Amino acid sequence: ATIGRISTGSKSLDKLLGGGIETQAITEVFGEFGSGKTQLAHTLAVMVQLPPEEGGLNGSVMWIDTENTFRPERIREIAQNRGLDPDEVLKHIAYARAFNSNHQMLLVQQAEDMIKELLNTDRPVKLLIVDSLTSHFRSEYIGRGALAERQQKLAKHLADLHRLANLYDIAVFVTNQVQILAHSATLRVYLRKGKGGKRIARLIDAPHLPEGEAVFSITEKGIED
């Protein structure tokens, strides 16, 4: 079935992404603390709700938070400044905090129930955010023996996420804070905060996709060129 593409709000980042983040894919954004990974997540959670001719998918959102970083006030700000009703935009976000990595993994199964419920309504789930994908795994699986174990558990979690993306035509967007390991996301985007506080994005290990870097700003509309 044909994939959909969610605009990020930045023409530059959209071009880097071939039009936007894809359904039937896991897009991982990685970078240091303060890079803007969670800002992009908030922005996407509003953009996906737009109609397709405005770069959205008329979609609902599910959000798994591991760091208490979801900010309903930020959603409100982005929505208002894009002509949308903040309370309606919030209504179409379903939110859960993951207590630990095992609960995070179970929450993906829990999410499937709502996905099925909304599937043939006019606002099916089209975006599933996991922010942070890795923070609980990093704190729990640590020390001698942990690299293999952690990588195994994370790969299984990502397999579960790939299944939801692919079976239900959803864009999965995940964040990873990075200061040699295998990764199984579909597309990896390195984000950094540069001079002037501009954010800069580069695709990693994607030789057939745009070489170049996108640059964008964090604004009251989420992100913009």
């Binding site: 959000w63 979801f70 976000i93 379903a94 939110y95 859960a96």
Partner: peptide
């Protein structure tokens, strides 16, 4: 999950 709960609505926001």
């Amino acid at each position: 999950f709960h609505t926001a």
